[PDB]
Amino acid sequence: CGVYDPAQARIEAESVKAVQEKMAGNDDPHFQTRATVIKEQRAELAKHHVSVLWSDYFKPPHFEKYPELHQLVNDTLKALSAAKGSKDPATGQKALDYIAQIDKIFWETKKA
Amino acid sequence: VYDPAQARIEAESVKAVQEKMAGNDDPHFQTRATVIKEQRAELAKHHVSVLWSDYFKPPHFEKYPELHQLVNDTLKALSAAKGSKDPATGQKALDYIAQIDKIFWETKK
Amino acid sequence: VYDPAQARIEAESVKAVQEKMAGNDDPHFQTRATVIKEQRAELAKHHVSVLWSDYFKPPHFEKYPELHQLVNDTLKALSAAKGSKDPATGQKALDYIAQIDKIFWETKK
Amino acid sequence: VYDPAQARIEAESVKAVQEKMAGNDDPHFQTRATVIKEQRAELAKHHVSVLWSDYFKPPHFEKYPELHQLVNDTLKALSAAKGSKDPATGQKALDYIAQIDKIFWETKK
Amino acid sequence: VYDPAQARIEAESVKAVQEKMAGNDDPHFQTRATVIKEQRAELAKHHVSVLWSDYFKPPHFEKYPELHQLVNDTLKALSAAKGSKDPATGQKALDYIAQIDKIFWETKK
Amino acid sequence: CGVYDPAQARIEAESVKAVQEKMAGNDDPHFQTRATVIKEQRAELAKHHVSVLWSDYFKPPHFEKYPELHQLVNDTLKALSAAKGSKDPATGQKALDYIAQIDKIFWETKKA
């Protein structure tokens, strides 16, 4: 407080995509199940990190300066939820795309 | 299978702990109360965030343009309650949650 | 500051997930459903267990001699739903929780 | 695959922390000790509760009619230690857990 | 107030789940078993890491130069067990834990 | 797997130091207690992240190539434990110093 960094969300969302990518490589049901367990945990951790930035780091001036930020954060969380439900790495990548947009705004607010 | 009652019950616990902190200034008790209040407020925030991210959909945010900011204020109110002993901060959090609850059940109709 | 509604809500998710499992045989969906069910049943169990350990007091147990066994039955009902895809097991857990809910509010009056 | 030793170990930490609290009045140390105690007692309670819900079965409860109340007493003993700095409260919890340990291993023979 | 028994009991749960996975290939059961095995192995690893970081001291690492690598191998064995259904991987983890336990109790003398 | 980054440990250890620094600014017992609660959680999260890198990311060749790494990781965890017990920001900073040493080795292993 107020030491926050979207790197946490990003790293956990990379785990999600990485796991998705491995699920194409190994049809072993045990492996598929473990991958699914891990992916569920990591996506939910990524969502917590995104949510925390939104509620705890970003403040009223940030939301006036970036009117799009509320919806962007909601979209990010929903993208992470869709990645959670999926084996398709494109869904993981979409969540990473959104997180990158949060990250860009974040580092701007550190400047002014 | 979402119900704002989960956020409510947790925020009610926050407020009840604040009230109890006013009636006993034993430092051990004060510390225990602070510990319990910190966890309850974070659980409440989790539950609120989950409604916002997982239950509410773009049609709802269209119909209720103030919803995004309401949820953010609610989470910020819960953080303020977390950092305070004043039961009125717990009550403000509950007030915000009641407004979410109103909208939530309106979308269930 | 307790409410068996917390247990109920979680047990309701258990049943809901069981129902979803009948309509979609995709292995990944079945796996995720199973993962989610496991967590939700254990959360419901935690809520039930806490009521029993922290809310209910000696006077309640003397007034309700069946309550120890009711709560244990509830927990085993939830474990049974955890290990099953049959929504009837989810409903049975809900039925037991409902019996705890009634007793709870009688003690609050 | 259960063992009341898990509950014991956690309850032992509770008592140990209570003892440390007598020899060091630094507020920060007292606060940390209180934080740690709270967690450890709740872990011990979780372990005790799981035994009761998941390990003990109807035959055990008929064979040991006092077991429901023994376990509930144990949990309240742990809650009492959680809310106290007196090592005697920690020891009382350990004593109850020891009674559960004996019953447990009788059921395993 | 450390005891390698916590790591052991958790790794014993890993092995018992692996054995049980060999006796029933129902996919729902297999998934549940995988979920439970994943949590147990991580708890075991947590407990092992805690002994290494919080209990063992520089004099111990001097007296037992192989201890650092033993602990790392133990954690790696537990990860291997986590990723496998072979009960022999669970047993290798327990074997490593038994070597830590031997050293641990030697340092208590 | 194998997507790991010592940034996670570092960010949580920065939280620890930041909290330590705030405890000098406000003598309110409630505030001191909250600071203590948060500091305990964040330090233990930092320790998990350090431990995970050591057990899950680093492999036998890394430990032969860096014979000091086992002890360095143990020192890092103990430093985080000492920071956990303390209000002195210097203890937080020491844990960050150690984490930086892990981070340097880490990014070398990503190159070869």
Q: How would you describe the overall organization of this protein?
A:
Six copies of one chain form a homohexamer. Chain A is mainly alpha-helical and 112 residues long. Chain A has one domain (1-112): Four Helix Bundle (Hemerythrin (Met), subunit A), CATH 1.20.120. The first copy, chain A, has helices spanning 7-23, 29-57, 60-65, 69-84, 89-109. In chain A, helix 1 (7-23) runs antiparallel to helix 2 (29-57). Chain A is elongated and about 50 Å long. The first copy, chain A, starts with 6 loop residues before the first helix and ends with a helix. Chains in contact: A-B, A-C, A-E, A-F, B-C, B-D, B-F, C-D, C-E, D-E, D-F, E-F. The interface between C and D is medium-sized, with 14 and 14 residues.
Structural class of chain A: mainly alpha
CATH architecture of chain A: Up-down Bundle
Oligomer designation: homohexamer
Share of residues in strands of chain A: under 5%
* Main sheet record of chain A: none
CATH class of chain A: Mainly Alpha
**CATH superfamily (homologous) name of chain A:** Nickel-containing superoxide dismutase
CATH fold category name of chain A: Four Helix Bundle (Hemerythrin (Met), subunit A)
> What's the helix-strand series of chain A?
HHHHH
Shape of chain A: elongated
Largest interface: C-D, 14 and 14 residues
**Count of separate structural domains of chain A:** 1
Number of helices in the DSSP assignment of chain A:
5
PDB class: oxidoreductase
Keywords: antioxidant, hexamer, superoxide dismutase, NiSOD, Ni
Assembly: hexameric
Entry title: Crystal structure of NiSOD H1A mutant
